[PDB]
């Protein structure tokens, strides 16, 4: 019995690509989707395969360290019995010198490049051939696959469609930008494989990383970490300072292809520059390429305050933010979390997600991975205290948007992240999320004299069992009477402020004459504003308070008997409150019923800081009963200070 001579192996690129929805990717290499049969044809030289004498065994391996235990290596006989869910090969057609086979892969096989080998034994003597290579991808058409989507129209949109829209602008002005995902363009798949092959998990344990690629949760997670630079292997370098001269402007890009190519072409070095939508767009491209159903989503925020300043000048809040959602089951979580999963590749690990959009709507923030981050992107919590009252100067999570299935229209998916405001479902979610509460008010607890230095306090009360780590900005500005804020006269900022369960703190800011003296207004008024930020759950506390800097009191002493029409002497004094000297000091005293003339006494010498100043005036009561003496004090730096004194006569 002559040994079979394999002439050639035909990969049936055409029939395979068509059937696996990978036609564009079947350049000259075979690409297929897992859990679905595919075809190949052996051409023999001489006699054909005779099942009765020939034994053919197939071998597949993927990655730098394949093993059967890890599912990255498989061996399987060419036979008639087909075990569903396994690697198998069976004959389906046999002609003169051709043998057509059908191969199937598990629906949870690791995706990646595979080398296919064939062992052909005729009784005693045997031979081995490398038939070729194929690439194996996730399969949204296969019901047993974790990324299965039951709607064909949605598989066209979220996997096969190479152009779409990315939403920008603002809630009020929703702007769309066209984008060429180009997931099937020449070279792109190879680049995506490289991207996996350079991720830190592959460096740490190659064989394990290749095996874990059976999971779209794992692959998604890895893609979310590799899109931003961080460790120079990453794809894009972010920049928001509006200065992109040594690179490409984030607003300029119209697709993912050039970015991916540039990255690879420079030895896997960051591409400049990106912003959120660009990170999201690339991720979407990579994920679609590998066959995980994905869409780019945009969320809008808005504003009308100390909050604004705090942001102007490490998570923060933009006019809009973009990320991706990807479709898959979650066998790693409690049942019922299959579906759309948010992944945020915009800059515990550099990765972010996947987290079920559903766990975010429900406030179930322990669900892996990174629920709080995504929750904080669509929920903020702003409260004022005037002395507690909800503040709406800040609104997060508006008009969440993504492209419509098979139409150039926008779909609003806000409902998928957030129950209606006021709804009882919304309240249950806030409750699951953040397990009376915490408050903040400006204290002074003292007199504040024009001229002095003194402290004000951000007084913070934590009446929950929870410990909070917060940022606190506490600052003061002069405030005129018409309410306009003048220049700042004291600031304090704590990046780390710790509040133990059921405790309180009075955080001080010193207010200094030197800083306020000259920036003061006609009012003698200073506004203290505090902002307490708790970044995890995205909660904000605002406390405001105006303060009145009082003028010194004019001491007025009457000396003598109050008897009807007897003589009396008035002693009038003021203690300089300034740490500097008063010049051109003059008191003015009058009062019908006590004196008939207006007494004005000049002060020759400058009144030194902290020093008192006395003058006296003889008075002549004339009628029984109450008379008020009235006094004005004038000077170069302290003006129109007043006082009075009741006097009763007998």
């Amino acid at each position: 019995a002559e040994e079979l001579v394999l002439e050639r192996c035909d990969l049936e690129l055409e029939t395979n690509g068509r059937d696996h929805h990978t036609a564009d990717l079947c350049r000259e290499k075979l690409v297929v989707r897992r859990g679905q049969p595919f075809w190949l044809t052996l051409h023999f030289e001489g006699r054909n395969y005779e099942a009765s004498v020939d034994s053919l065994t197939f071998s597949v391996v993927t990655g730098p360290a394949p093993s059967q235990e890890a599912g990255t290596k498989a061996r399987f006989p060419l036979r008639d019995a087909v075990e569903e869910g396994d690697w198998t090969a069976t004959v389906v057609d046999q002609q003169d010198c051709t043998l057509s086979l059908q191969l199937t892969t598990p629906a949870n096989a690791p995706i990646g490049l595979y080398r296919l080998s064939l062992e052909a034994s005729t009784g005693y003597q045997g031979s081995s051939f490398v038939l070729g290579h194929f690439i194996l991808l996730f399969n949204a058409w296969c019901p047993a696959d974790a990324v299965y989507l039951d709607s064909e129209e949605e598989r066209q949109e979220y996997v096969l469609t190479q152009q779409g829209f990315i939403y920008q602008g603002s809630a009020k002005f929703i702007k769309n930008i066209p984008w060429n995902f180009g997931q099937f363009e020449d070279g792109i798949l190879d680049i995506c494989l490289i991207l996996l092959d350079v991720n830190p998990k592959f460096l740490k344990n190659a064989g394990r990383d290749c095996s874990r690629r059976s999971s779209p949760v794992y692959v998604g997670r890895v893609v979310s970490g590799m899109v931003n630079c961080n460790d120079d292997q990453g794809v894009l370098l972010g920049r928001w300072d509006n200065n992109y001269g040594d690179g490409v402007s984030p607003m300029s890009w119209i697709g993912s292809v050039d970015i991916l190519r540039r990255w690879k072409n420079h030895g896997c070095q960051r591409v400049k520059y990106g912003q959120c939508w660009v990170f999201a767009a690339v991720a979407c491209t990579v994920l679609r390429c590998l066959g995980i159903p994905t869409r780019v989503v945009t969320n809008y925020n808005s504003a009308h305050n100390l909050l604004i300043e705090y942001f102007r000048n490490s998570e923060m809040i933009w006019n809009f933010h973009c990320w991706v959602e990807s479709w898959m089951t979650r066998p790693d979580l409690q049942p019922g979390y299959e579906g759309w999963q948010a992944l945020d590749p915009t800059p515990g690990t550099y990765c972010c997600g996947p987290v079920p959009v559903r766990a975010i709507k429900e406030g179930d923030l322990s669900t892996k991975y990174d629920a709080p981050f995504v929750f904080a992107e669509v929920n903020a919590d702003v409260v004022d205290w005037i002395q507690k009252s909800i503040n709406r100067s800040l609104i997060v999570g508006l008009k969440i948007s993504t492209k419509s299935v098979g139409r150039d229209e926008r779909e609003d998916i806000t409902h998928t992240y957030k129950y209606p405001e006021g709804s009882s479902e919304e309240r249950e979610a806030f409750t699951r999320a953040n397990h009376t509460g915490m408050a903040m008010r400006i204290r002074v607890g003292q007199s504040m004299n024009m001229g002095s230095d003194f402290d004000v306090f951000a007084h913070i009360t934590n009446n929950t069992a929870e410990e909070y780590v917060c940022r606190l900005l506490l600052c003061a500005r002069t405030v005129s009477y018409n309410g306009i804020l003048g220049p700042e006269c004291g600031t304090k900022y704590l990046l780390n402020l710790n509040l133990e369960p059921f405790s309180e703190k009075s955080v001080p800011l010193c207010i200094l004459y030197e800083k306020y003296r000259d920036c003061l207004t006609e009012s003698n008024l200073i506004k203290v504003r505090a902002l307490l930020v708790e970044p995890v759950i995205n909660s904000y506390l605002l406390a405001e308070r105006d303060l009145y800097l009082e003028n010194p009191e004019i001491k007025i002493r009457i000396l003598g008997e109050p008897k009807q029409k007897r003589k009396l002497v008035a002693e009038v004094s003021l203690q300089n409150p300034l740490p500097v000297a008063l010049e051109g000091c003059t008191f003015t005293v009058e009062g019908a019923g006590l004196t008939e003339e207006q007494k004005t006494v000049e002060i020759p010498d400058p009144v030194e800081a902290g020093e008192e100043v006395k003058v006296r005036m003889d008075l002549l009561p004339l009628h029984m009963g109450l008379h008020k003496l009235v006094v004005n004090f004038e000077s170069d730096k302290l003006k129109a200070v007043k006082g009075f004194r009741n006097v009763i006569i007998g």
């Binding site: 504003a303 923060m316 933009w318 006019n319």
Partner: peptide
């Protein structure tokens, strides 16, 4: 994107 700009800080809100």
């Amino acid at each position: 994107a700009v800080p809100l």
